[PDB]
């Protein structure tokens, strides 16, 4: 059924090259695009870049593209794989690479094929993608569950001015009754926030960062959080809207400690914090603000810190760089009681099947799963169909600005509309969306 496998370079939302794959079958042409992160988990599967400093500042994907076209394609076509057998598709791809971290072909060569095969499979089966993905993952479909969108509204951290160390501040309309309502009220808080931001930080403070949130010179998480609370209140949405954070603590972890002044070029080791000290910051924030989720509070291999904090955190704790959507690392994180939610980024692992396994393992342990974009996204809408397919009840796909973000949120509106009464909104139950009766 697959007659052609073809890759090209296209541009992600930051204007950097990435791999787009097209699979041709009797049912037509099926396209998937590979996303890209920044300051990525050190344990993520290989994102292969050309490193030709003379083109694209070394970020070309000509090499990965060649791997699709000259290596994967002729082997994939001749193998007569049934695309409906996602496991077979991905087992073949993994077998062809032959390395733990897809370092022979690149995860960005393999993933596009994995994802395109699933769209081709849905076409063959004459079902929408989300229905096929539920089939693949054996998720229940009566009712489907539409996710709470965790909307980035403000960014701090390594790519913003000011001293604010924490990376993502998100609003989650857990109190909304429908996904349509969630997106609307979230857009309204967003606009209220841009307005307040411009009034307080200047006209330019309205400009947006990579994920679409405002990113002005902010000094402390409390400053950011007071600001967001002000916007929520102004928009009249207190008590339908809660807050999520992504600390991205791996970006300020050095030598075993946490440097919150990691931007400040002369940081004093005397106030680099231990895990417990940093845990005390998060505790203070929790007491003061309506935070319902915290992601990467500690660094990607700092197990003792995660495990100590998790006992008493009492809210959703999400693993991103800790777990890297990798069933092996997820197993450890479960055993160590380090977290209770997986941030699922398909390109961290490089195949759909491994990503589905990642999610099944997390649900089995009573963990939640937040499906997630990358900071470098594209017009590809796969993750919208995925979060519904896996019935997780929560997605993180950016601010309600920039269309590499709206593209997913818009796909969710279409999915919501298509399903009518055969879908529920996750709402207060986002953590265990998969277990909703």
Residues at the annotated binding site? Answer: 159, 168, 246, 295, 320, 372-375, 396
Cα first-last separation, the chain? 38
* 400: contact with a second copy by CB under 8 A: yes
The SS3 call for residue 9 is strand
The token pair that represents 130 in the structure block: 């989300």
Question: Between β-strands 316-319 and 291-295, what pairing exists: parallel, antiparallel or unpaired?
Answer: parallel
Phi then psi dihedrals of residue 386, to 5 deg: -60, -55
* Cβ closest to a second copy, residue 241 vs residue 294: 241
Q: What's the rounded Cα separation, in Å, for the pair 107 and 418? A: 33
Query: Facing residues of 351 across strands?
Result: none
CB neighbours of residue 207 within 10 Å: 12
**Is 240 known to be catalytic?**
no
**Is 78 known to be catalytic?**
no
Per the annotation, binding residues for Mg(2+) are: 246, 295, 320
Q: C-alpha angle 107/108/110, rounded to 5°?
A: 60
Query: Facing residues of 395 across strands?
Result: 149, 371
Query: Which parts of 26-90 are beta strand (E)?
Result: 28-33
Q: C-alpha angle 167/377/105, rounded to 5°?
A: 110
Q: Which of 3, 80, 126, 204 binds a second copy (CB under 8 A)?
A: 204
* Cβ closest to Mg ion, residue 89 vs residue 313: 313
In the complex, least distance from residue 416 CB atom to a second copy, rounded to whole angstroms:
10
Stretch in the footprint of a second copy (CB under 8 A) among 38-46, 88-96, 210-218, 358-366: 210-218
Report the partner that residue 56 touches, choosing among Mg ion, a second copy, none (CB closer than 5 to 8 A by kind). Answer: a second copy
Q: Which of 106, 147, 209, 350 binds a second copy (CB under 8 A)?
A: 209
In the complex, least distance from residue 123 CB atom to a second copy, rounded to whole angstroms:
11
Q: What's the rounded Cα separation, in Å, for the pair 318 and 368? A: 8
Q: Which of 9, 24, 141, 307 binds a second copy (CB under 8 A)?
A: 9
Q: Which of 320, 340, 361, 404 binds Mg ion (CB under 5 A)?
A: 320
Q: Which of 407, 419, 423, 426 binds a second copy (CB under 8 A)?
A: 407
Q: For the stretch 62-95, what's the b/e string if a residue is b when 16 or more beta carbons lie within 10 angstroms of its beta carbon? A: bbbbbbbbeebbeebbeeebebbebeebbebbbe
* Cβ closest to a second copy, residue 22 vs residue 222: 22
In the complex, least distance from residue 397 CB atom to Mg ion, rounded to whole angstroms:
13
* Contacts with a second copy, residue ranges (CB under 8 A): 8-16, 20, 55-57, 159-162, 183-184, 187-188, 190-191, 202-209, 214-217, 377-379, 399-404, 406-407, 409-410, 413-414, 417
């Amino acid at each position: 059924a697959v007659s052609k496998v073809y890759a090209r370079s296209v541009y992600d939302s930051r204007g950097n090259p990435t791999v787009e794959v097209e699979l041709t079958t009797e049912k037509g042409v099926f396209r998937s695009i590979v996303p890209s992160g920044a300051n990525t988990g050190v344990h993520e599967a290989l994102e292969m870049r050309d490193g030709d400093k003379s083109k694209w500042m070394g970020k070309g994907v000509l090499h990965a593209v060649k791997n699709v076209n000259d290596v994967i394609a002729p082997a994939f076509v001749k193998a007569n794989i049934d695309v409906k057998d996602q496991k077979a598709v991905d087992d073949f791809l993994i077998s062809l690479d032959g390395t733990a971290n897809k370092s022979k072909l690149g995860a960005n060569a393999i993933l596009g094929v994995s994802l395109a095969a699933s769209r081709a499979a849905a076409a063959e089966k004459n079902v929408p993608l989300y229905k096929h993905l539920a089939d693949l993952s054996k998720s229940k479909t009566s009712p489907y569950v539409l996710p709470v969108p965790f909307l980035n509204v403000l960014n701090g951290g390594s790519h913003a001015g000011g001293a604010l160390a924490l990376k993502e501040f998100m609003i989650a309309p857990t109190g909304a009754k429908t996904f349509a309502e969630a997106l609307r009220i979230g857009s309204e808080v967003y606009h209220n926030l841009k307005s307040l931001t411009k009034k307080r930080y200047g006209a330019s403070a309205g400009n947006v960062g990579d994920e679409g949130g405002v990113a002005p010179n902010i000094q402390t998480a409390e400053e950011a959080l007071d600001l967001i609370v002000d916007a929520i209140k102004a928009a009249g949405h207190d008590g339908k809207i809660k807050i999520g954070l992504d600390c991205a603590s791996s970006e300020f972890f050095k030598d075993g400690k946490y440097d919150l002044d990691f931007k400040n070029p002369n940081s004093d080791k005397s106030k680099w914090l231990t895990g417990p000290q940093l845990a005390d910051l998060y505790h203070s924030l929790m007491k003061r603000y309506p935070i319902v989720s915290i992601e990467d509070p500690f660094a990607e291999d700092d197990w003792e810190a995660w495990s100590h904090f998790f006992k008493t955190a009492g809210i959703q704790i999400v693993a991103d760089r800790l777990t890297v959507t990798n069933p092996k690392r997820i197993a450890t994180a479960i055993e160590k009681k380090a977290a209770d939610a997986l941030l699922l980024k398909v390109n961290q692992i490089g195949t759909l099947s491994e990503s589905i396994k990642a999610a099944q393992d997390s649900f089995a342990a009573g963990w939640g799963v937040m499906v997630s974009h990358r900071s470098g996204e594209t017009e590809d809408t796969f993750i919208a169909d995925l979060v519904v397919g896996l019935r997780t009840g929560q997605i993180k796909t950016g601010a309600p600005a920039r269309s590499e973000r709206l593209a997913k949120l818009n796909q969710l509106l279409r999915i919501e509309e298509e399903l009518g009464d055969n879908a529920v909104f996750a709402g207060e139950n986002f953590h265990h969306g998969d277990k909703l009766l």
